A paper describes a structure:
Import of proteins into peroxisomes depends on PEX5, [name] and PEX14. By combining biochemical methods and structural biology, we show that the C-terminal [name] domain of [name] mediates intramolecular interactions with a proximal [name] motif. The [name] domain also binds WxxxF peptide motifs in the import receptor PEX5, demonstrating evolutionary conservation of such interactions from yeast to human. Strikingly, intramolecular interaction of the [name] [name] motif regulates binding of PEX5 WxxxF/Y motifs to the [name] [name] domain.
In this study, we present a high-resolution structure of the human [name] [name] domain with an intramolecular [name] motif, demonstrating the structural basis of this non-canonical interaction with an [name] domain. Structures of the apo [name] domain and [name]-(GS)2-[name] were solved by X-ray crystallography at 1.8Å and 2.3Å resolution, respectively. Backbone hydrogen-bonds are formed between A376 and G335 as well as S379, F381 and K336. The negatively charged sidechains E374 and E378 show electrostatic interactions with K304, E305, K336, and a water molecule. Interestingly, nine out of the eleven Arg and Lys residues are located at the [name] binding surface, forming a positively charged surface area, which is favorable for binding negatively charged peptides such as the C-terminal [name] motif. The crystal structure was confirmed in solution by NMR titration experiments of the isolated [name] domain with an [name] peptide (350-403). Strong chemical shift perturbations map to the binding site seen in the crystal structure, and spectral changes at saturated binding are very similar to the native [name]-CTR protein.
Residue numbers in the entry: 265 to 340, 371 to 382
The structure:
């Protein structure tokens, strides 16, 4: 999964809050953690969730409003905007 590793273009986000997964579909993270997100083109429609990776291999759902979207980064609506904007 090349967006997860950052081999492909991907979105980067910073967790605002701690989050413990309650199902296997979800991934845990801590406030301040950096995650890679699928591009909007690869995002599933699950109200209140986004597809992300903490570890660069494992993917799952995180609550959209538990992270700050920082922008699109090249592979080696305030939120809709941030998904198309460039990461510094």
């Amino acid at each position: 999964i090349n967006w997860a590793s950052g081999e492909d273009d991907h979105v980067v986000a910073r967790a605002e809050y701690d989050f413990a997964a309650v199902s296997e579909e979800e991934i845990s993270f801590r406030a301040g953690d950096m995650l890679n997100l699928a591009l909007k083109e690869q995002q599933p429609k699950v109200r209140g969730w986004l597809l992300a990776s903490l570890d660069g291999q494992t993917t799952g759902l995180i609550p959209a409003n538990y992270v700050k979207i920082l922008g699109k980064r090249k592979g080696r609506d305030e939120q809709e905007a941030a998904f198309e904007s460039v990461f510094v």
